[PDB]
Enzyme design. Structure first.
Site, PDB file in Angstrom:
ATOM      1  N   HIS A  41      -0.296   1.745   8.079  1.00 28.98           N
ATOM      2  CA  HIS A  41      -0.695   2.553   6.924  1.00 28.98           C
ATOM      3  C   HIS A  41      -1.905   1.971   6.157  1.00 28.98           C
ATOM      4  CE1 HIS A  41       1.256   0.224   3.684  1.00 28.98           C
ATOM      5  NE2 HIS A  41       2.417   0.243   4.333  1.00 28.98           N
ATOM      6  N   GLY A 143       0.673  -4.200  -3.208  1.00 25.47           N
ATOM      7  CA  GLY A 143      -0.123  -5.234  -2.552  1.00 25.47           C
ATOM      8  C   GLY A 143       0.678  -6.173  -1.657  1.00 25.47           C
ATOM      9  N   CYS A 145       2.624  -5.272   0.899  1.00 27.63           N
ATOM     10  CA  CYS A 145       2.759  -4.774   2.273  1.00 27.63           C
ATOM     11  C   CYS A 145       2.156  -5.735   3.284  1.00 27.63           C
ATOM     12  CB  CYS A 145       2.157  -3.377   2.405  1.00 27.63           C
ATOM     13  SG  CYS A 145       3.048  -2.119   1.458  1.00 27.63           S
TER      14      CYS A 145
HETATM   15  C1  LIG Z   1       2.501   2.172   0.702  1.00 36.25           C
HETATM   16  C2  LIG Z   1       3.722   2.920   0.124  1.00 36.25           C
HETATM   17  C3  LIG Z   1       4.741   1.927  -0.501  1.00 36.25           C
HETATM   18  O1  LIG Z   1       5.942   2.092  -0.353  1.00 36.25           O
HETATM   19  N1  LIG Z   1       4.227   0.886  -1.197  1.00 36.25           N
HETATM   20  C4  LIG Z   1       4.977  -0.154  -1.806  1.00 36.25           C
HETATM   21  C5  LIG Z   1       5.577  -1.093  -0.967  1.00 36.25           C
HETATM   22  N2  LIG Z   1       6.311  -2.117  -1.419  1.00 36.25           N
HETATM   23  C6  LIG Z   1       6.449  -2.240  -2.741  1.00 36.25           C
HETATM   24  C7  LIG Z   1       5.911  -1.369  -3.671  1.00 36.25           C
HETATM   25  C8  LIG Z   1       5.159  -0.283  -3.194  1.00 36.25           C
HETATM   26  C9  LIG Z   1       4.621   0.777  -4.133  1.00 36.25           C
HETATM   27  C10 LIG Z   1       4.704   0.404  -5.608  1.00 36.25           C
HETATM   28  C11 LIG Z   1       6.001  -0.305  -5.952  1.00 36.25           C
HETATM   29  C12 LIG Z   1       6.139  -1.578  -5.148  1.00 36.25           C
HETATM   30  C13 LIG Z   1       3.251   3.783  -1.073  1.00 36.25           C
HETATM   31  N3  LIG Z   1       4.334   4.671  -1.518  1.00 36.25           N
HETATM   32  S1  LIG Z   1       4.616   5.905  -0.494  1.00 36.25           S
HETATM   33  O2  LIG Z   1       5.835   6.540  -0.890  1.00 36.25           O
HETATM   34  O3  LIG Z   1       3.419   6.691  -0.415  1.00 36.25           O
HETATM   35  C14 LIG Z   1       4.858   5.073   1.032  1.00 36.25           C
HETATM   36  C15 LIG Z   1       5.558   5.742   2.029  1.00 36.25           C
HETATM   37  C16 LIG Z   1       5.757   5.124   3.251  1.00 36.25           C
HETATM   38  C17 LIG Z   1       5.236   3.860   3.462  1.00 36.25           C
HETATM   39 CL1  LIG Z   1       5.557   3.046   4.973  1.00 36.25          CL
HETATM   40  C18 LIG Z   1       4.517   3.195   2.487  1.00 36.25           C
HETATM   41  C19 LIG Z   1       4.341   3.780   1.233  1.00 36.25           C
END
Ligand SMILES: C[C@@]1(C(=O)Nc2cncc3c2CCCC3)CNS(=O)(=O)c2ccc(Cl)cc21
Ligand SMILES: C[C@@]1(C(=O)Nc2cncc3c2CCCC3)CNS(=O)(=O)c2ccc(Cl)cc21
Ligand SMILES: [Cl-]
Lengths: 305, 305
Positions: A41, A143, A145
């Site tokens: 992603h 950040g 990921c």
């Molecule tokens: C990259 C993202 C994600 O979860 N970011 C994230 C990952 N770990 C922690 C935190 C976040 C965000 C803020 C809080 C803390 C973005 N949200 S999404 O629903 O579009 C989505 C959906 C699927 C995947 Cl594989 C990634 C993401």
């Protein structure tokens, strides 16, 4: 004496963390030999997440569209491929700090250490378990990921997790190092939710044995139970079913303490019914399920108090 | 999201751990530049521990009586001296992995990371706090002596603890890196006990702010209190007194959440007088006191090293 949630020393993994940038997105990568592994992603915008076509997004990319930074040195990308939900960036420099390693896919109930990273820089280390609903209760901000999960039995690092996502309830989802997600999750922003979670019964039993080894027996009783009767009670408290494999795995802890597994099951049944009555077990007022039988053996003394 | 007991990445400290042997005793040492630092009780036998005269025991030892092993390389001791309860062994090789470092003495209530070691080899990392009674609730077995406690500030490792002893209640005692003990403890086998401990109030408040940042608000109320009235209640539950300095230190967390410190004190007063009523805060049924205000800020911000 004592019992703490202990993580593996993170040095061998710290020497593998890098920053991967694609356009306006920046996350972490794992640099082993001449390959950098990161979530696929990284090539997506927020709008792309609703319905991403990774094959179509990736074909529009060249090697020089990926910026990889290891410390204050820019690595050069000389190839790229996708394997499941991970991106594999071939670089022109092999990591001189690459440790002895393996990629292992773990099962629910298994624990591992997480090295939380931001911009390719490690910030902290903590211990986690793969929940029965295939999520982890981590501590991740935007950040993080690409941060990885691992175990280090002997001098070999077994990488088991790479961070990809946070779900609506604040729990986390990711893949093994071959890009296969744990659970029914996808790297797409869709209606995805953590399923009903349950308590890891074999791990609670392991931690009760740790409490006995450290000198506490208040919770024991004169009763025993059949395995089926214990499971009928356990499922009423959202506890995972205990299998013959779990009873077998608890064998060494049963021998060290002299307490049969089904007799410890009877203490667990009573604790679920009664609560602790103002008492603690190893400094906790809740029944702890993120220590495996292997973790208790690794940390506890081989001599019961 | 998420909140875990997080330790600092241990890599910079792992590269300093060595094994020190004197006669039949083996423990850990910290190798910085050309000096190896270890507990002075390495020169004691079991009989010598009842009433040691360290100056008399040390004068009978020569440089070659100390065996120092760094990995699978034998270092050569070329000098030795004693500073308080710490032995300083001058070696012929400077540690090529010496990080930027400082020796700092911490105050009770402060947290740090511990890298548990056996035979000069790191086994695990965990977080702990210096209790008001100057002991730590660590996890150590025989052979752990010489393991160190530390914090990291950007690139600099601040060593604050070296492990020396386990007390009868299973809690631990040690010194700063200048060999000065934390607490009224001595390095000999005599009747020593942990004094009555208290709860670190400023840390409980910091963790309540962490719960609000993560979406736990059930414990909040419309009430406020004064510093004096809150301290009258706190003293009754064996909680440390809250000072104006503590209120000042909680300032940034108060601003991020919009909850005045005395407003949060009124929530803690009700939790102390009424309990949790079957509820949890950040997955705990007890009021957690091993997270400082700075630890909460760092974990809810993503500070890297
Ligand atoms: C990259 C993202 C994600 O979860 N970011 C994230 C990952 N770990 C922690 C935190 C976040 C965000 C803020 C809080 C803390 C973005 N949200 S999404 O629903 O579009 C989505 C959906 C699927 C995947 Cl594989 C990634 C993401
Ligand atoms: C060296 C020793 C110690 O506490 N070792 C130890 C340290 N950490 C953990 C564990 C131990 C022992 C076995 C259980 C686990 C030994 N006991 S003592 O009362 O003679 C004593 C007295 C003073 C000092 Cl500075 C050290 C010690
Ligand atoms: Cl597994």
């Amino acid at each position: 004496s004592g019992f703490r949630k202990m993580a593996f020393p993170s040095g061998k993994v710290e020497g593998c963390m890098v920053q991967v940038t694609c356009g306006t997105t920046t996350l972490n990568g794992l640099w082993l030999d001449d390959v950098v592994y990161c979530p696929r992603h990284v090539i997506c915008t927020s709008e792309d997440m609703l319905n991403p076509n990774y094959e179509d997004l990736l074909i529009r990319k060249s090697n020089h569209n990926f910026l990889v930074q290891a410390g204050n040195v820019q690595l050069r990308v000389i190839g790229h491929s996708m394997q499941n939900c991970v991106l594999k960036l071939k670089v022109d420099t092999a990591n001189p700090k690459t440790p002895k390693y393996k990629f292992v896919r773990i099962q629910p109930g298994q624990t591992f250490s997480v090295l939380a990273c931001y911009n390719g820089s490690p910030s902290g280390v903590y211990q986690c378990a793969m929940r029965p609903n295939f999520t982890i209760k981590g501590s991740f901000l935007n950040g993080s990921c690409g941060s990885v999960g691992f175990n280090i039995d002997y001098d070999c690092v077994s990488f088991c997790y790479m961070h990809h996502m946070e779900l609506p309830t604040g729990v986390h989802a990711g893949t093994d190092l071959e890009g296969n997600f744990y659970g029914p999750f996808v790297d797409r922003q869709t209606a995805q939710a953590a399923g009903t979670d349950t308590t890891i019964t074999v791990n609670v039993l392991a931690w009760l044995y740790a409490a006995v080894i450290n000198g506490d027996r208040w919770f024991l009783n004169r009763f025993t139970t059949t395995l089926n009767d214990f499971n009928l009670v356990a499922m009423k408290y959202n506890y995972e079913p205990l299998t013959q494999d779990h009873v077998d795995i608890l064998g060494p802890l049963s021998a060290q303490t002299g307490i049969a597994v089904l007799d410890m099951c009877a203490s667990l049944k009573e604790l679920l019914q009664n609560g602790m009555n103002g008492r603690t077990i190893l400094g906790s007022a809740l029944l702890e399920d993120e220590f495996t039988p292997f973790d208790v053996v690794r940390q506890c003394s081989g001599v019961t108090f």
